Amino acid sequence: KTHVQLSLPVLQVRDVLVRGFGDSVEEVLSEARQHLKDGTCGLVEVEKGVLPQLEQPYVFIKRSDAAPHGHVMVELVAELEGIQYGRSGETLGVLVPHVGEIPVAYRKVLLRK
């Protein structure tokens, strides 16, 4: 399928144990996609002071359309030293590995895979 219905655990930035997916734009997008497929991907909602607490490159989920079965259509955009790889809509949050942190909520998304 070109799209996959996911429910992403929303994590508090201070709980996150692994604060990024790797060391290159290509690696973080690769790793993010693998974790999304394996159900091992968390979401951190971006506010003032969140991003400087996480590791670059960042992976964002961004709204790709204006929401089947409650699932917002999203795609991945990476960012490194203020340059983004991809173009999409509004940020829903920053992706991080999920290694068993307790979430505060779930974000239903339809991921363009």
Curated annotation (Swiss-Prot):
Subcellular location: Host cytoplasm
Full-protein interval shown: 11 to 125 of 7096
Organism of derivation: Severe acute respiratory syndrome coronavirus 2 (2019-nCoV)
Entry superkingdom: Viruses
Its job: Inhibits host translation by associating with the open head conformation of the 40S subunit. The C-terminus binds to and obstructs ribosomal mRNA entry tunnel. Thereby inhibits antiviral response triggered by innate immunity or interferons. The nsp1-40S ribosome complex further induces an endonucleolytic cleavage near the 5'UTR of host mRNAs, targeting them for degradation. This inhibits the integrated stress response (ISR) in the infected cell by preventing EIF2S1/eIF2-alpha phosphorylation upstream of stress granule formation and depletes host G3BP1.
Descriptive protein name: Host translation inhibitor nsp1
Region listing for Disordered, in residue ranges: 1-113
Domain CoV Nsp1 globular: 2-113
Gene of this entry: rep
